[PDB]
Amino acid sequence: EEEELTLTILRQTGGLGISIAGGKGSTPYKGDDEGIFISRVSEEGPAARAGVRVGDKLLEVNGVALQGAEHHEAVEALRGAGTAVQMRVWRE
Amino acid sequence: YSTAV
């Protein structure tokens, strides 16, 4: 079971309702992948309603790939991604 | 580590 999903998180203000872990140069979410992963989804928050799932690997934010991104770079991308944030994710 | 966004 491997799939790629395009999820659109909608917000008026505030956060997306997720936590991300990992990134280049940080402790990985899993030993075999240094990338950005969803470590927590807020109960029935924006991301939850958009269909995000813990363990999802975040490939892109509004068309900008996070391959090779440091943890802070992914954080900045999600914070400044706007009110409609489309995420290409990898789910197993 | 995690960052809430």
Residue numbers in the entry:
A (entry chain A): 723 to 814
B (entry chain C): 310 to 314
What do the study's own words say?
To understand the interactions of SCRIB PDZ domain interactions with NS5 PBM sequences in more detail we determined crystal structures of SCRIB PDZ3:NS5_CTN complexes as well as a structure of SCRIB PDZ3 apo. Isothermal titration calorimetry revealed that only the C-terminal PBM NS5_CTN bound to SCRIB PDZ3 with a KD value of 18.4 ± 1.3 µM. In the Scrib PDZ3:NS5_CTN complex, His1071PDZ3 contacts Ser3412NS5 in the −2 position in the canonical manner observed in many other PDZ domain complex structures. Our crystal structure of SCRIB PDZ3 bound to PBM sequences revealed an interaction with a conserved His residue. Mutation of SCRIB PDZ3 H1071 to Ala ablates binding, whereas mutation of SCRIB PDZ3 K1040, which is not involved in NS5 engagement, did not significantly impact binding affinity. This supports the notion that SCRIB PDZ3 H1071 plays an important role in the NS5 CTN engagement.
The Scribble (Scrib) protein is a conserved cell polarity regulator with anti-tumorigenic properties. Scribble is an important regulator of cell polarity and acts as a scaffolding protein to mediate a diverse set of cellular signalling pathways via its four PDZ domains. The zoonotic Tick-born encephalitis virus TBEV encodes for the NS5 protein, which has been shown to interact with Scribble in a PDZ domain dependent manner. In summary, we show that TBEV NS5 C-terminal PBM binds SCRIB PDZ3 in order to interact with Scribble.
